[PDB]
Amino acid sequence: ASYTWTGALITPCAAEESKLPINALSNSLLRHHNMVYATTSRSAGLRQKKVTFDRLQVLDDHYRDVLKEMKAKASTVKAKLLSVEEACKLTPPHSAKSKFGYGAKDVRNLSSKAVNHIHSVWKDLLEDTVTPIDTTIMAKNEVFCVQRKPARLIVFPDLGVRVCEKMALYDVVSTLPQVVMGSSYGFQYSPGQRVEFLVNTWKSKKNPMGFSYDTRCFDSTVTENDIRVEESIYQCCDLAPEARQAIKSLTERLYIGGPLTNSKGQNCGYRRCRASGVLTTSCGNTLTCYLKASAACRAAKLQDCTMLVNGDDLVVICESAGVQEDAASLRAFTEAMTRYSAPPGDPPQPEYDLELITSCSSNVSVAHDASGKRVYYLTRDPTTPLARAAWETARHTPVNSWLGNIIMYAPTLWARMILMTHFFSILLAQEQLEKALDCQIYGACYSIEPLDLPQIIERLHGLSAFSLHSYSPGEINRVASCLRKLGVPPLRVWRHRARSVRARLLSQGGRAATCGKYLFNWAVKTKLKLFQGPAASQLDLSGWFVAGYSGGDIYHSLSRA
Numbered sequence: 001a002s003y004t005w006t007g008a009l010i011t012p013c014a015a016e017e018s019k020l021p022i023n024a025l026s027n028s029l030l031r032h033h034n035m036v037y038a039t040t041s042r043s044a045g046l047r048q049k050k051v052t053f054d055r056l057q058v059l060d061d062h063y064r065d066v067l068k069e070m071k072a073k074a075s076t077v078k079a080k081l082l083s084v085e086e087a088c089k090l091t092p093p094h095s096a097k098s099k100f101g102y103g104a105k106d107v108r109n110l111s112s113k114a115v116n117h118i119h120s121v122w123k124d125l126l127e128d129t130v131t132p133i134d135t136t137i138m139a140k141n142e143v144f145c146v147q148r149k150p151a152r153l154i155v156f157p158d159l160g161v162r163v164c165e166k167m168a169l170y171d172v173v174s175t176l177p178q179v180v181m182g183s184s185y186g187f188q189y190s191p192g193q194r195v196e197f198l199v200n201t202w203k204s205k206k207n208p209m210g211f212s213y214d215t216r217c218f219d220s221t222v223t224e225n226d227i228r229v230e231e232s233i234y235q236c237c238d239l240a241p242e243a244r245q246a247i248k249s250l251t252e253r254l255y256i257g258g259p260l261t262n263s264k265g266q267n268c269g270y271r272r273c274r275a276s277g278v279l280t281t282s283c284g285n286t287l288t289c290y291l292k293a294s295a296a297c298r299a300a301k302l303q304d305c306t307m308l309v310n311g312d313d314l315v316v317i318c319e320s321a322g323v324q325e326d327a328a329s330l331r332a333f334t335e336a337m338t339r340y341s342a343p344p345g346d347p348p349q350p351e352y353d354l355e356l357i358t359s360c361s362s363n364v365s366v367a368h369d370a371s372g373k374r375v376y377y378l379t380r381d382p383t384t385p386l387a388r389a390a391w392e393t394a395r396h397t398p399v400n401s402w403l404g405n406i407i408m409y410a411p412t413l414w415a416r417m418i419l420m421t422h423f424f425s426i427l428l429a430q431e432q433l434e435k436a437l438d439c440q441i442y443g444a445c446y447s448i449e450p451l452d453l454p455q456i457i458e459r460l461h462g463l464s465a466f467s468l469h470s471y472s473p474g475e476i477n478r479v480a481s482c483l484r485k486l487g488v489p490p491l492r493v494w495r496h497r498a499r500s501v502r503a504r505l506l507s508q509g510g511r512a513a514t515c516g517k518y519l520f521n522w523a524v525k526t527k528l529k530l531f532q533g534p535a536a537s538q539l540d541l542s543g544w545f546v547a548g549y550s551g552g553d554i555y556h557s558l559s560r561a
């Protein structure tokens with residue numbers, strides 16, 4: 001059973017905002033504020049019913065053939081332990097405080113109280129490889145639009161354990177998946193690299209067929225054998241005997257399961273599946289999903305199939321054998337996945353147009369550059385990104401989703417017209433363009449200076465990201481519908497706001513004038529010629545798009561010279 005419950009409630013640790021706070025700045029983004037809600041602990045019971053069930057898992061020679069192949073590639077990886085200090089510097093500054101009298105700032109500053117407790121948690125992992133470690137169960141406060149959705153749940157150990165996880169497994173979860181999975185590992189790609197992989201893979205098939213597979217409650221479908229199988233993959237690496245012991249221990253004491261404690265210290269129940277807030281959530285889920293999907297591909301006898309995995313998110317592109325044969329092949333793949341304990345949520349179906357395949361809430365779309373050439377870029381429905389941006393305008397947040405969206409979806413119609421214009425306008429008026437903001441890229445937290453956005457966008461997306469026009473009608477209709485749905489002003493209100501912001505930025509010189517020139521070139525009557533090359537101070541963007549760290553509690557720093 002994925003979970004058992006004591007009856008104790010999942011409790012909030014503070015007052016939870018449920019509805020969007022009206023603001024004379026929030027209303028300039030969207031009028032219809034009633035459409036925007038935030039999930040709360042009051043819907044935890046609805047989530048608990050969904051995530052609670054018995055698993056049925058039947059492994060076969062296909063699963064075993066794939067596992068052995070993965071284990072072979074895993075054996076070529078050498079991973080080193082991090083020092084207490086290396087692991088302390090990887091902690092986000094607003095990471096949950098320890099129950100042992102210290103917090104993220106104390107960990108990041110290497111306080112004797114933190115460090116000495118971190119040494120003791122570590123010594124216990126080496127001496128006890130059995131006693132379940134305590135975890136906290138919370139309900140996530142995530143902002144959405146109505147179409148009404150229950151709070152997703154977060155399970156995580158204490159700050160001391162989290163630093164110990166980094167020490168034992170940061171090098172593994174950063175290095176291992178790409179070696180084992182190759183081109184199928186999604187987090188090695190920037191949005192543009194993902195699109196390149198998808199478009200080239202589609203173009204490589206005589207008769208392309210594609211599909212996304214949605215596993216219903218993937219974390220709940222992850223059985224204790226699944227977590228023992230990931231550890232056996234981790235143990236295939238060239239590791240020091242101390243890392244091996246800490247990895248074995250972290251597995252049996254934490255990753256396979258353990259007791260759930262609410263915010264007021266009451267025992268909620270017991271977990272026997274994936275913890276969403278441990279270092280290995282991303283890596284483990286990616287390995288497990290790729291393993292199950294790769295073996296199901298063989299069971300289904302799918303022809304020349306290529307898959308792209310990002311945690312629980314899977315997309316498979318193969319050679320179509322006709323609509324009838326493809327539906328039957330997909331029944332075979334779904335039946336195999338079900339046996340491996342990965343049954344579908346939304347049932348999969350073949351698709352014969354790459355724009356119509358959604359994976360990672362995203363799809364490949366097409367636009368034209370300044371020279372009129374076709375440019376494939378990654379887009380998504382802008383509802384959730386826009387609703388979150390409205391919430392971030394009204395109420396202060398530690399992590400700014402609008403900036404991570406501007407970075408990942410920079411070539412898109414909606415990020416450029418709305419998000420860039422809105423937040424550069426706010427930052428100008430507030431005199432805070434220089435101030436670095438915290439945001440997430442593939443789960444990891446980064447402190448990014450907004451004045452560096454033309455340089456960031458150019459490196460990840462290309463100079464075309466500033467000249468894209470003639471977007472597909474399907475993209476336009478989805479964006480247009482969303483503006484009409486949420487009460488977002490039309491293009492003409494955004495072009496005046498953009499021209500005004502552009503003039504104001506150019507008058508300031510420096511990095512500000514670069515933002516004006518580059519970001520808002522779409523606003524002016526006749527676009528200026530833009531040329532490629534580096535900026536006066538080039539950031540180190542190599543650590544970005546290496547691995548996924550969602551739930552991992554990872555914080556990355558930016559170099560420059």
Ligand SMILES: O=C(O)c1sc(-c2ccccc2)cc1N1C(=O)CC[C@@H]1C1CCCCC1
Pocket residue numbers: 412413416417468469470471472476479480490491522
């Ligand atoms: O060229 C286009 O296909 C479109 S479709 C569209 C549109 C569709 C529905 C609602 C609102 C806007 C606008 C454009 N664009 C133009 O007027 C010229 C380039 C620009 C986009 C470029 C990206 C930043 C914002 C403006």
